[PDB]
């Protein structure tokens, strides 16, 4: 049981390079539109406090160098959707897959294809933290990198990368250009809200450990759902809903461990610690596997 | 600092399924050859104690169903090399990347593209353990999934999946069909040697910690490589080879910390513990980041 990402081939066939002036970053080429972060039009001076509509109107179609591999594509139009720039090109991407743009909720996961200069560099899995950051690996020039999920050769794009907070976590937008969280595409040091742990995900991961023969954390006790949430919120865990309980059903039936039994086990682990032991190799309670993630991988 | 796979699409373009009777696994289609585990020719009952040479004499080119998607590729030749079947087909794969077959060393990492019925399913990073197993995630129908590294648009194929040991780790061959480790493609309970900590990767991790300013563990002493190997074995840590010292070179140069000085720092960590302190936030020493992986992320 490892953190598994979706195969990235369908998304690699879409990453291009977008250059405006001195600024370079990645774009996503679907059909005859190239999507990228709008701050590619900014100078270093602009980025301190940019007026984007104002800065964009002074731009021409020919200010934008879009390169797909070696081939350069000609921009025949440009418009802005929130923090995302849409560049119209005169050529449709033949590798465009069946796609959709979604906005994911906190706690859900996606694969991140990290690109630099329009070249895919690596893929890994991430979750939308409850404070709307993501704990990624992104260096300089990774803006435009997108996150996504795949459902029967339909790619749901849910994230485009824009910034690293001073704490080392990352922030970005959906493909409509709306940031996840209270962040703004300005060159300013920005803090996030207090992060919390994704509870339904930690439980899904405990189930995965049992399905794989780890049971040392289990116990005899049970807890009411409200009493578990009292302890949970004390340790900065998100509360557990009845929906979350049903989402976990399969894993409960698969293992024969009732959700509320699994909540007693997790409750003790938060009160007692792990005593130096490990679960599925981790010394920490892991919260970036969703129940579906676990289900898909174990069956 | 996280586990990060290579992009998988260059390998996706080469996954097909190979079927004999009712045994289906995955195969690897490069030019006009398809590579897959030879036990595809076995019925489940022959797998218990197969005679691959006897079994192969009775199969013919028309016993092999190779499908790219729902599309059949006609098999026009077949040979067996070690534990892999090599099926010559009548179409060169137009998505064939530039590629090589390489046999990796324990400690090295690669990406795995888990496949089922010739359809990619997921991708993740593995390290070859010193006991020649890997801690993968494979289900039924995963055999023939491959592991690979990419350097400068060149895919180096290094692993092909054959089995799950009772302990739940996995084992397989290089792309010439030679098992990593003392395992055999028989349907049988097999046991790997005791695992050990991958020292070269632990040292890579300490370099990573220094690059990011976490360097409390740097000590004032040095060591010889023979002495470090001897003590490390006493803590269940792999000895270092000359090649291990060399692939540590760029990280040694970037930090100014000589390799044998960093060994003495690790030796002190081994004999005195971490004293509740952490390194890169963690209390455990991480051993599945090669020096390449550390640089690749900096
Ligand atoms: C994109 O590459 C931008 O073209 C870049 C990616 C980050 C660079 C280092 N690692 C990355 O993930 N993004 C940025 O530089 C963004 C640009 C904004 C959205 C206009 N800015 C930041 O990530 C940023 C700014 C500041 C800051 O200011 C002052 C202070 C502290 C942190 C910080 N991060
Ligand atoms: C391939 O899918 C098979 O073509 C399959 C993959 C494993 C199934 C579960 N997870 C996997 O990684 N491989 C096998 O089933 C192989 C087939 C051999 C090479 C003929 N066998 C095993 O992995 C196997 C057999 C036995 C066993 O026997 C008895 C006892 C214990 C473990 C075990 N593993």
Residue numbers in the entry:
A (entry chain B): 3 to 301
B (entry chain A): 3 to 300
Lines quoted from the article behind this entry:
The main protease (M pro) of coronaviruses plays a key role in viral replication, thus serving as a hot target for drug design. M pro is able to process polyproteins to produce several nonstructural proteins (NSPs) necessary for viral replication. The recognition site of coronaviral M pro depends on Gln at the P1 position, and no proteases in humans share a similar cleavage site. PF-00835231 is an inhibitor designed for the main protease of SARS-CoV that emerged in 2003, but its clinical trials were suspended due to the rapid disappearance of the SARS outbreak.
To understand the mechanism by which PF-00835231 inhibits SARS-CoV-2 M pro, we solved the crystal structure of SARS-CoV-2 M pro in complex with PF-00835231. The resolution of the complex structure is 2.21 Å. SARS-CoV-2 M pro is a homodimer in the complex structure and can be divided into three subdomains, namely, domain I (residues 3 to 99), domain II (residues 100 to 199), and domain III (residues 201 to 300). The narrow cavity between domain I and domain II contains the inhibitor PF-00835231, which is present in both protomer A and protomer B. An enlarged view of the narrow cavity revealed that PF-00835231 occupied the S1, S1’, and S2 subsites of SARS-CoV-2 M pro in an extended conformation. According to the electron density maps of both the A and B protomers, PF-00835231 forms an additional C-S covalent bond with the sulfur atom of Cys145. The 4-hydroxy group of PF-00835231 occupies the S1’ pocket and forms a hydrogen bond with the main chain of His41 in M pro. The lactam ring of PF-00835231 occupies the S1 pocket of M pro, and the nitrogen of the lactam ring forms hydrogen bonds with Phe140 and Glu166 directly or via a water molecule (W) when the carbyl oxygen of lactam forms a hydrogen bond with the nitrogen of His163. While the leucine moiety of PF-00835231 occupies the S2 pocket, the indole group of PF-00835231 occupies the S4 pocket of M pro. The carbon of the indole methoxy group is covalently bound to Thr190, which is specific to the A-chain. The covalent binding of 5231 to Thr190 occurs in chain A but not in chain B, possibly because the location is dynamic.
